[PDB]
């Protein structure tokens, strides 16, 4: 094939994120800024709670949803 295999997905890409929701009635907004290497299967993100903090529940339950 003649197509650029990485026309869309580049070796080094950035990430932006906003999460909204609530756990047991406790509402929150969390922002994220990160980077990753798609073909290496790696990503890193800096998360910051913007509303509802300090969260009254385990942060770990959120992490696979970023």
């Amino acid at each position: 094939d003649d197509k650029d295999p990485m026309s869309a997905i580049k070796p080094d890409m950035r990430i932006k994120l906003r999460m909204e929701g609530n756990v047991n009635g406790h509402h929150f907004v969390i922002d994220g800024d990160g980077t990753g290497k798609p073909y290496e299967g790696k990503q890193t993100m800096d998360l910051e709670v913007k509303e509802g903090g300090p969260l009254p529940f385990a942060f770990d339950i959120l992490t696979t949803a970023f």
Binding site: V23, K42, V49
Partner: protein
């Protein structure tokens, strides 16, 4: 975001083939004590940046349980099984949270993945190994640095 997976050449990469338009996923988390979460992400791409619109709703967590009491330590590395279920790419996984006091708290995940573009070829059944970890955090988790590694096989 499963675009961040090392796919070998002999497995179809649904996630990278979903771009530039993007894809979405819908997930159920069901915990051993009745806690239940529903999560979803709409993933688009503009230039070199993936944008994520995430929603997370959790209920039925017991007040005395490890989630509301903040007794968790980390997720254990695990393997997601990818397969076509009623025509939709589906991932199932049994995950476990390490707790304080030499204990684990188990959770079943089902996720469906949908390419925004019609005609993105569904992959054959395979597996994705991953590990997720918090590298650093504030005392109250107002700020958290997160890292994940994932590889597809079989």
């Amino acid at each position: 975001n499963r675009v961040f997976v090392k796919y070998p050449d002999n497995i179809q990469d649904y996630f990278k083939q979903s771009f530039p338009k993007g894809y979405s996923w819908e997930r159920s988390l069901t915990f051993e004590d009745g806690g239940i979460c529903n999560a979803r992400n709409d993933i688009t791409m503009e230039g070199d940046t993936f944008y994520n619109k995430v929603r997370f709703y959790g209920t039925n967590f017991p007040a005395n349980g490890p989630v509301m009491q903040k007794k968790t330590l980390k997720w254990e590395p695990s393997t997601e099984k990818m397969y076509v279920r009623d025509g939709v790419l589906t991932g199932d996984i049994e995950m476990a949270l390490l707790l304080e006091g030499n204990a684990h708290y188990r959770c079943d995940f089902r996720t469906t993945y949908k390419a925004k573009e019609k005609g993105v070829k569904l992959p054959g059944a395979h597996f994705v190994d991953h590990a997720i970890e918090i590298l650093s955090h504030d005392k109250d988790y107002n700020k958290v640095k997160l890292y994940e590694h994932a590889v597809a096989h079989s």
